[PDB]
Amino acid sequence: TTHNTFVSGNCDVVIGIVNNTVYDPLQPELDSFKEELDKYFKNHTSP
Amino acid sequence: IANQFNSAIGKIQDSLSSTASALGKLQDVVNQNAQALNTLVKQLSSNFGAISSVLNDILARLDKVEAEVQIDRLITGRLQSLQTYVTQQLIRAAEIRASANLAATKMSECVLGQSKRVDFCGKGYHLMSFPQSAPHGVVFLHVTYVPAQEKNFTTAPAICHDGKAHFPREGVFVSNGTHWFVTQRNFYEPQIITTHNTFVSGNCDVVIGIVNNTVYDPLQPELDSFKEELDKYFKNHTSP
Amino acid sequence: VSMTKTSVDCTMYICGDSTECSNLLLQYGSFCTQLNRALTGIAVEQDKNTQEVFAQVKQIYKTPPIKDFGGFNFSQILPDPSKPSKRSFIEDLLFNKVAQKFNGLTVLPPLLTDEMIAQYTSALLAGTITSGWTFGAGAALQIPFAMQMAYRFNGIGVTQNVLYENQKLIANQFNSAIGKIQDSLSSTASALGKLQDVVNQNAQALNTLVKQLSSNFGAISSVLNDILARLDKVEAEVQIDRLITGRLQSLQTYVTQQLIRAAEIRASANLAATKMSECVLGQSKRVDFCGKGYHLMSFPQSAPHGVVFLHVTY
Amino acid sequence: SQSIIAYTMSLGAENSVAYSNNSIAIPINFTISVTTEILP
Ligand SMILES: *[C@@H]1O[C@H](CO)[C@@H](O[C@@H]2O[C@H](CO)[C@@H](O[C@H]3O[C@H](CO)[C@@H](O)[C@H](O)[C@@H]3O)[C@H](O)[C@H]2NC(C)=O)[C@H](O)[C@H]1NC(C)=O
Ligand SMILES: *[C@@H]1O[C@H](CO)[C@@H](O[C@@H]2O[C@H](CO)[C@@H](O[C@H]3O[C@H](CO)[C@@H](O)[C@H](O)[C@@H]3O)[C@H](O)[C@H]2NC(C)=O)[C@H](O)[C@H]1NC(C)=O
Numbered sequence: 001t002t003h004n005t006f007v008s009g010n011c012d013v014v015i016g017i018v019n020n021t022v023y024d025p026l027q028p029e030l031d032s033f034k035e036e037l038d039k040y041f042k043n044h045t046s047p
Numbered sequence: 048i049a050n051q052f053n054s055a056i057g058k059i060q061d062s063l064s065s066t067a068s069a070l071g072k073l074q075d076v077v078n079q080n081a082q083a084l085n086t087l088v089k090q091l092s093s094n095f096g097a098i099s100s101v102l103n104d105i106l107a108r109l110d111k112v113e114a115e116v117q118i119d120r121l122i123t124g125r126l127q128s129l130q131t132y133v134t135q136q137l138i139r140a141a142e143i144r145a146s147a148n149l150a151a152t153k154m155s156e157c158v159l160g161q162s163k164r165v166d167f168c169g170k171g172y173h174l175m176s177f178p179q180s181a182p183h184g185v186v187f188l189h190v191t192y193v194p195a196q197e198k199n200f201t202t203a204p205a206i207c208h209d210g211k212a213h214f215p216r217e218g219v220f221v222s223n224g225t226h227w228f229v230t231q232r233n234f235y236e237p238q239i240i241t242t243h244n245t246f247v248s249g250n251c252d253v254v255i256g257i258v259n260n261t262v263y264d265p266l267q268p269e270l271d272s273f274k275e276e277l278d279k280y281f282k283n284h285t286s287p
Numbered sequence: 288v289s290m291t292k293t294s295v296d297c298t299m300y301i302c303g304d305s306t307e308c309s310n311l312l313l314q315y316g317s318f319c320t321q322l323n324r325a326l327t328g329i330a331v332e333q334d335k336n337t338q339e340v341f342a343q344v345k346q347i348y349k350t351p352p353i354k355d356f357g358g359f360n361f362s363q364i365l366p367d368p369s370k371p372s373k374r375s376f377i378e379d380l381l382f383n384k385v386a387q388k389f390n391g392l393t394v395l396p397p398l399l400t401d402e403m404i405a406q407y408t409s410a411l412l413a414g415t416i417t418s419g420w421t422f423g424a425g426a427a428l429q430i431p432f433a434m435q436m437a438y439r440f441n442g443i444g445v446t447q448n449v450l451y452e453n454q455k456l457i458a459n460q461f462n463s464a465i466g467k468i469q470d471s472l473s474s475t476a477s478a479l480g481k482l483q484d485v486v487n488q489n490a491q492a493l494n495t496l497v498k499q500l501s502s503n504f505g506a507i508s509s510v511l512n513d514i515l516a517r518l519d520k521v522e523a524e525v526q527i528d529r530l531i532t533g534r535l536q537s538l539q540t541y542v543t544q545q546l547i548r549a550a551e552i553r554a555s556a557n558l559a560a561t562k563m564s565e566c567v568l569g570q571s572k573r574v575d576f577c578g579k580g581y582h583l584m585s586f587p588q589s590a591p592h593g594v595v596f597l598h599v600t601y
Numbered sequence: 602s603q604s605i606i607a608y609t610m611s612l613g614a615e616n617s618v619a620y621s622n623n624s625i626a627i628p629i630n631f632t633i634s635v636t637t638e639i640l641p
């Protein structure tokens with residue numbers, strides 16, 4: 001997660017850097033906050 | 048970092064191929080053993096009050112009754128010389144014992160580890176060390192991080208933003224003049240001050256010399272980008 | 288750290304002005320070049336002990352003239368310019384508690400005069416209260432003094448806001464803490480008695496060494512000229528050789544006490560060089576190594592034949 | 602042209618330091634240094 005790691009600069013310099021997900025856990029929360037908001041707009045389409 | 052390491056090992060070699068007295072601490076104890084044995088031998092030529100210092104020169108010229116009065120002096124001189132030499136060597140055998148137990152402590156803490164003791168694994172901050180065999184000795188090539196180019200910065204103990212005091216979790220606050228950053232204590236790598244770099248405690252009354260700047264929050268702009276997208280969905284849904 | 292240097296000459300000590308005695312000395316061999324070498328090996332080392340304890344910094348650091356320390360009143364341990372010596376109020380006190388002689392006993396001077404030992408102390412201290420620890424591990428980098436004290440607290444697992452929330456109390460404690468050691472040191476003796484206990488043994492060894500000149504060993508006097516002025520040159524030697532074999536046992540013992548104590552003094556000076564490194568040039572986490580408690584910082588102080596550490600502990 | 606001289610020994614290089622309650626010095630660069638320490 002972004003909490004198990006820290007950040008600096010870009011992939012040119014770090015010899016043997018590897019590609020992966022870093023899975024920021026704020027976002028699989030706030031996506032599920034937007035999908036709940038989208039349910040509120042879909043409910044607001046009904047009246 | 049590798050080129051500073053390789054440069055330094057190349058210099059350590061170039062010095063050991065050019066300077067004489069670097070190994071002087073080992074030369075010194077070999078010189079003591081050479082000098083103390085030479086002294087133990089030079090005592091043998093002493094007459095000590097006997098007719099001669101060659102004991103065969105007593106046993107070739109005197110009979111037992113008078114040879115005794117000569118030989119007993121030679122025993123006295125020599126025995127005292129050995130009680131002297133062995134006591135001098137015992138006192139040295141501890142000078143070595145202590146040098147060995149210091150070298151075994153350094154072998155263990157500096158080679159088999161990394162010590163947060165100052166000056167115990169060479170000068171600087173310790174990274175690692177390497178043992179070399181020397182005759183009757185050890186050499187530790189201690190490898191150390193030393194800070195090299197420095198500049199002045201203005202600093203403050205805390206940043207005040209919401210009347211709450213923010214402090215670094217690690218590092219220190221630095222101003223280049225225009226801005227405020229937070230940097231790791233032993234290398235200048237400034238960062239935007241955030242809730243991740245800084246923890247909070249109490250209020251700006253109590254901290255002597257506190258200063259004012261904003262502390263960045265990564266949540267508010269990101270959740271504002273969702274409020275601008277929310278605004279469109281609200282404006283759209285006026286039309287049906 | 289040091290002990291009082293001495294040097295003693297076989298020729299003077301065994302022979303008060305007799306060539307008959309001096310030929311009877313030469314009869315034994317290299318003993319007297321060897322005993323000149325033994326005491327030289329101590330005298331070249333009490334300087335080495337002073338250098339390994341004080342020379343741990345390769346620059347001299349000077350205090351700023353302002354007392355911009357955020358509450359901490361170090362003036363008691365920095366210099367007092369009003370003295371003819373550049374020492375502190377505390378270091379003056381350490382000298383308030385603690386030519387050549389007949390018979391060839393002598394006391395050689397230290398390589399570093401006390402004024403130069405006090406100078407190294409004032410520089411190690413001026414580093415300590417301005418440069419963080421960095422004047423050890425590299426170049427000197429200034430840091431605000433109370434922000435150094437914050438690193439100390441962050442070192443002993445206290446969160447640094449606890450300093451900035453209480454810096455007034457932490458100073459009003461600290462100024463009292465350096466005030467209470469004054470009142471102790473003003474009146475108690477035994478607080479420095481460890482150095483006096485070293486000096487007493489070198490004095491008690493010299494008292495013995497000179498006392499042993501006054502001994503017969505079966506000879507018709509303890510005195511050399513009072514044997515020459517009576518017995519003629521051949522029958523005298525039965526007397527003078529007994530004064531030699533006596534006096535030479537006396538040196539062989541005195542040098543054996545001085546070498547064995549020089550090793551005890553070395554062990555105490557090398558421990559002090561470790562205290563100076565870990566307690567003055569840094570902040571150790573060895574528990575109770577820099578005084579009893581959690582360590583924050585320590586200040587060296589110059590004393591006769593020793594170093595004194597004022598350790599600060601939470 | 603050589604001579605033996607004699608002198609009061611210095612304690613090495615002088616350094617008055619620019620301390621202030623709001624000034625810090627921070628390193629921007631560093632040296633990896635190797636030293637040799639020799640023990641009997
Ligand atoms: C880690 O992920 C990187 C992408 O985030 C990836 O870099 C990308 O690699 C591809 C394939 O080599 C490149 O594709 C293009 O290659 C050249 C231009 O470089 C073009 O002529 C081709 O037509 C093709 O479009 C991407 O341009 C490149 N992108 C970036 C940002 O570098 C790394 O290769 C991955 N590394 C590892 C070790 O997995
Ligand atoms: C203190 O450090 C600051 C951070 O580096 C620095 O301010 C930064 O200056 C750079 C230029 O070197 C700015 O970069 C922008 O410059 C123009 C702005 O119109 C654009 O064309 C560029 O693309 C780029 O965006 C940074 O924006 C600026 N950073 C911040 C946080 O404001 C200061 O100059 C330093 N001050 C001192 C006294 O040293």
Ligand SMILES: *[C@@H]1O[C@H](CO)[C@@H](O[C@@H]2O[C@H](CO)[C@@H](O[C@H]3O[C@H](CO)[C@@H](O)[C@H](O)[C@@H]3O)[C@H](O)[C@H]2NC(C)=O)[C@H](O)[C@H]1NC(C)=O
Binds near residue numbers: 258259
């Ligand atoms: C650090 O930032 C603080 C907030 O920006 C700032 O405090 C503000 O100081 C001003 C000027 O003294 C006060 O202004 C008020 O002054 C009196 C009451 O003291 C009123 O009669 C006036 O009408 C006026 O409102 C602010 O009230 C005060 N604000 C807060 C929330 O504290 C500090 O002074 C700054 N300090 C430094 C060194 O930058």
Ligand SMILES: *[C@@H]1O[C@H](CO[C@@H]2O[C@@H](C)[C@@H](O)[C@@H](O)[C@@H]2O)[C@@H](O[C@@H]2O[C@H](CO)[C@@H](O)[C@H](O)[C@H]2NC(C)=O)[C@H](O)[C@H]1NC(C)=O
Binds near residue numbers: 618619
């Ligand atoms: C750190 O700063 C000090 C002094 O402060 C500076 O003074 C002005 C000249 C200007 O630069 C201000 O913005 C600063 O606040 C520097 O100290 C001087 O150093 C030189 C030798 O380099 C010496 O001749 C002066 O006597 C010093 N003056 C004082 C008052 O100490 C210092 O060089 C700066 N160091 C770094 C690493 O940035």
Ligand SMILES: *[C@@H]1O[C@H](CO)[C@@H](O[C@@H]2O[C@H](CO)[C@@H](O)[C@H](O)[C@H]2NC(C)=O)[C@H](O)[C@H]1NC(C)=O
Binds near residue numbers: 354362363
């Ligand atoms: C640091 O502490 C000393 C010792 O208490 C202070 O010295 C006293 O100062 C007052 C005011 O100048 C005098 O009236 C006293 O006679 C001083 N006593 C002694 C024993 O000298 C000193 O003022 C303090 N310094 C700082 C910078 O606060």
Ligand SMILES: *[C@@H]1O[C@H](CO)[C@@H](O)[C@H](O)[C@H]1NC(C)=O
Binds near residue numbers: 015
């Ligand atoms: C690691 O070693 C292999 C050879 O064994 C080499 O091909 C590879 O490039 C090396 N990787 C890095 C990051 O240097």
Ligand SMILES: *[C@@H]1O[C@H](CO)[C@@H](O)[C@H](O)[C@H]1NC(C)=O
Binds near residue numbers: 255256353355622
């Ligand atoms: C630092 O000292 C100067 C006086 O020399 C003063 O103007 C300034 O306000 C002080 N700041 C702090 C935080 O003590």
Ligand SMILES: *[C@@H]1O[C@H](CO)[C@@H](O)[C@H](O)[C@H]1NC(C)=O
Binds near residue numbers: 279280283
């Ligand atoms: C508005 O809603 C319609 C569906 O009713 C959709 O096609 C359109 O993409 C939406 N646009 C915005 C800007 O929300």
